Amino acid sequence: TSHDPDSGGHFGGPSGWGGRYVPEALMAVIEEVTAAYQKERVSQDFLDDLDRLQANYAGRPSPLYEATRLSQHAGSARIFLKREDLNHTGSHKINNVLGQALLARRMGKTRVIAETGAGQHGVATATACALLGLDCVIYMGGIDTARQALNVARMRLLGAEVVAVQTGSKTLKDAINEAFRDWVANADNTYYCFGTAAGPHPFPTMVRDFQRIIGMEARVQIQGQAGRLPDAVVACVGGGSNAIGIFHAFLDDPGVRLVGFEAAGDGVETGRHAATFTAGSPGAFHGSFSYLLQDEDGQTIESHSISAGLDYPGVGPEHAWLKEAGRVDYRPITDSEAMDAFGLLCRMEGIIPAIESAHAVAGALKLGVELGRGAVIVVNLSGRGDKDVETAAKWFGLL
Amino acid sequence: IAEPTSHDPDSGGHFGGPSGWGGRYVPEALMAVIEEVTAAYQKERVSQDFLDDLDRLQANYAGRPSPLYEATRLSQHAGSARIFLKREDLNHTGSHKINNVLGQALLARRMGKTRVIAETGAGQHGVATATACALLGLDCVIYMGGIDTARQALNVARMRLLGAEVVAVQTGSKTLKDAINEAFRDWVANADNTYYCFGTAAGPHPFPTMVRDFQRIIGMEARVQIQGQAGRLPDAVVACVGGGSNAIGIFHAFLDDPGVRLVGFEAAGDGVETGRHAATFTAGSPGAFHGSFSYLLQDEDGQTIESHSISAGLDYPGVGPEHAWLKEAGRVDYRPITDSEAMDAFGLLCRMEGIIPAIESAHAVAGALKLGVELGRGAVIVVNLSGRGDKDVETAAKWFGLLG
Amino acid sequence: EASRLGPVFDSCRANNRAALIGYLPTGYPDVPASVAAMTALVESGCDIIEVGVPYSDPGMDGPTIARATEAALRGGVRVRDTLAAVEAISIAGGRAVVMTYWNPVLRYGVDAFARDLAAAGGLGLITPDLIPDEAQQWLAASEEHRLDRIFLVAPSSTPERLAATVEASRGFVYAASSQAAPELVGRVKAVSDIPVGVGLGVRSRAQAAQIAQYADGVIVGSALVTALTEGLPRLRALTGELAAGVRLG
Amino acid sequence: EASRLGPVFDSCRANNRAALIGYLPTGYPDVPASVAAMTALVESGCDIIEVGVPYSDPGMDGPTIARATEAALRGGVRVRDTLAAVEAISIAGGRAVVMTYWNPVLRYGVDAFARDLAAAGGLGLITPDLIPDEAQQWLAASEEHRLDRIFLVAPSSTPERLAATVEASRGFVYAASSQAAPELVGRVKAVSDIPVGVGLGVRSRAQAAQIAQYADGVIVGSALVTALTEGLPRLRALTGELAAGVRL
């Protein structure tokens, strides 16, 4: 398509977003996955299995719901919620996993590994591996196993082995490091089911392609319900999978604003945040050239966020390309702002969101005040908040 | 258009005779509000504008229609029969309870009620009620048994985040039947402004019929989906049975299909011979309990026998009157399923299909497996996967030794 | 013919007073003690004794009576023990009606229970969870065995249901429930001459005199249980004070 | 004309032996102690010194080196400390290359880092996470500032990629990893004469002898870090033992 990278995975030509910043030891399996995806993405047998699982198993299409009780809290704008929280396993991650798990089987791989931070990608990977009869190992930071314990037990119930990563900041970037070390050693029989729109080529493109169904549905649904294209489409941005998935169908609609909201932790001025675009700079990290939080020597600055899914110091390269082109704007949302939107969504619409998604809801409220009455703002509600109930109840003193 | 009236009770709420199952075994102090709810429901059930409001929430808010998934990897454990899962676990809040709650909360707004009370055992109906009351701007008070608040603690905190007051009931067996008694006491004292959003297909008229009508959508959708995916009507439709809402909801569209068997599975706990069970149809007898005349567990004097089950949603010694009528008429078979059988099916669904079911729904999966061996190769069996097991994850992890 | 409780209210209205109707649950604190306390009520001036059948799930019972019935059930109280209490009350020269939820009557057999109740000297049945809409079997056994049927009316009762409930009642009408109670009695008397008993959480002689102004009978239950818990002499004292309150001159 | 490390492998080929290549990370246990240890390597007979740049997320480094670079970063090591360590090695008559992950180079600037590395006396750059497919800026910087570019090959390397990786390398080729090490060297020697270094978790004098039979150079790192952790004399003795195994 018009927005795809070259055969080397580079977005935007000379700027060099993406690519493959991996060791040569991984190139045989990386090229192996790239070829298998190019072969199967045009195979009707493959596409039939994917659509069929998304329909009868994952529960697609997810609905688009106008949260009318939020309007007065958003400058009387019209907030539409793309209800990815209603998917099987409870987030958008199942979209990307069903595609990659089917691909892992087409390649003959007998083992699937994955990282997880909020646990949603781990639960999704474990879910598809149980369905397809694949061995599954999930790497999860020790801090993430504590604050997302519900998903740890869900993964173990689904037959997946969970390895707690205790190195580094014990969060998402540390689980990715360990899963990389695993893939290097077991590349000939193990498929790496990467969970976000980052990594080396072909993963930023392939993950986005499996998440494009979100925006394609949203673009049809918003025209049917509102009579026109939205004034803005917003989503939270950790690595960038749920945002790029809903953004993509609107890239060529020049009137549609696109805003991604990243985690700002205790505040961007505090050094305890994950605001990659707000405070980071270009660099090579986790297989791609993109933005990341780094110090003056290029060492990765550890991120912090109340949300485990956005607690990541990097970002996918296609987002760095869209920021450079000025097509998408990226704004910070703090822990406090996200938790306010959390409770507000509970009391107004009876929807308990993932703390990740609460960032997008918080930014939508601020964008609604800017755009004014009658403005249509589509929000990607990436997941539900079952995993975050303990954290949120403690935040509001309900114990 | 709108649904039928072929299997409805009489104006007094009786199934199969003017002194048969159902009725209103309530005090006179409740009759004013009960007649008001009955009049309000008779009016709105034939209002297209009401059904439009409900359908609009069911589609854009609840995410209907729920898919029908053929769990091919269960076939070998069900005598090579074909198990089809009605995926109510994918509804908003994660169970079938949201179907009935949306209808009754819409009705409560139409009646001008400002306060909504509800009981809950597994916490799914309580979360659904709290969800709708937040959505519609209604004050919400949920009554839950003290034991149930401990084993379904995830739903307790969800209800509090939605803004509802959760009251732990300490009387009786501290479970579902005792939460119902306390919710009843609340309604008697606050009938002026409070709507009682009952969570199952039981209670006094009109609640058995109204709950069933709001859950009818399950069977209507499944009857279409199964013919499209399998090419014929199923050989059987099965569901678990607590009070009977999810079972009657999927059973109803198939009632006039004479070749379609209907099997409800009730919780047998440690075993029907142990006295620690909830097998209402297996071990109970007719009586007047919780506003209706139906089956219930009762001793020689008529005192209610306390029930027991690992499932908080099936831990109820009674059952809805329409199920008693369908049983006496021989239209539906009701069988027991023990805790061990349900937990085996729970783990099997996790291992084979990547679906974590509610422990309630695992009873229906366990019964479908046995029914598959009974029916044999090629038999088409639809199973109502009433809910997801996020609430039961801690209990299930302890059962399978993932803790210690 | 006339109702079994007719003469009692006729005799009370002749003496410018209301009937004192006392409730006690069978088997609290045990079967012999409860029978002793019900006899003491007869000796202390109770005109009618409501013999309560402990039920496992009594939705209409207040906390005082709920705990007492739970204790009685733990002690193994039986429905037949309620029939024995009616016998002991009839022997002592008393007048007993039974108050019960409907399921123990169904399990016993509606006809058989009415037969055995009338045989034991019982005069009527108070049915707090049985409405006339469902009382087809009970209305038949009531006429057959000459037992009064006391249904309940509430402040929220519609005019149609209050009239139908009063029409279905024999003996007296239970006006279960501030000016709500006298208004409810006034609505029953606008349509019928049947005696009306009033339950109002009575616990003192003063309140029993307030109700005796407009009501044909004063119903006391929770205060009797609380007095019995303290002791049999305390029950005798309270019943005596209530017997004075129902009198006016 | 020729590679910078060429004359070193020629001197080892005439003396009928392999070159001893030693790795040590800058700033462990601190910057002065690491520079003193790197000078000790030159004195104890190391032909080439791999000066390691500690990185915050070293995906390719083993546990001994990863924990050493973690301690160095905790101690506040900077990238300029590596260039200062290269100068101290070149002044002490040694021959040093820098092994780093690529992001510290991107942050520094590829051309600026090559220029300052060459000015410090550095001879080349080992790039474990930079494949030739992304080395456009580095290929140009390697030419202008006359620096060797040591890429890595692997057992799983396809024939097409192994040829492209070898064609892009100057100085020597890092064969990183049963019978895989000599088999991987044989596949490199079948397409080019460029020297081949082999890293295999070398611990003992005997292991360096087995590798010197087919490899042009023997790469030791984890064992040197473990030696320096016990003491500076232990590093000298081990480096001396390894200096004898390569001559067999």
Ligand SMILES: Cc1cc(F)c(-c2ccc([C@H]3[C@H](C#N)N[C@H]3CF)cc2)c(F)c1
């Ligand atoms: C799908 C996918 C595949 C990947 F190989 C990686 C990856 C690549 C490299 C690293 C190492 C790199 C080296 N050596 N420096 C570390 C951090 F960058 C870690 C992870 C990933 F993040 C996602």
Ligand SMILES: Cc1cc(F)c(-c2ccc([C@H]3[C@H](C#N)N[C@H]3CF)cc2)c(F)c1
């Ligand atoms: C929607 C709905 C409405 C109801 F009024 C009841 C109900 C009725 C009666 C009781 C009381 C009864 C008396 N008095 N004995 C207790 C147990 F039966 C409790 C609850 C219910 F269960 C559901």
Ligand SMILES: C=C(NCc1c(COP(=O)(O)O)cnc(C)c1O)C(=O)O
């Ligand atoms: C990291 C994963 N979660 C990220 C996440 C995100 C952010 O991930 P993106 O890749 O930026 O979409 C958003 N919403 C939900 C519900 C999430 O769980 C995970 O489950 O491992």
Ligand SMILES: C=C(NCc1c(COP(=O)(O)O)cnc(C)c1O)C(=O)O
């Ligand atoms: C008792 C409650 N639920 C019962 C329940 C049941 C049994 O309810 P029925 O009324 O039998 O459909 C089945 N499945 C799930 C997921 C349930 O939560 C409750 O949450 O209040």
Ligand SMILES: [Cs+]
């Ligand atoms: Cs498995």
Ligand SMILES: [Cs+]
């Ligand atoms: Cs980020």
Ligand SMILES: [Cs+]
């Ligand atoms: Cs759907």
Ligand SMILES: [Cs+]
């Ligand atoms: Cs039951």
Ligand SMILES: [Cs+]
């Ligand atoms: Cs166990």
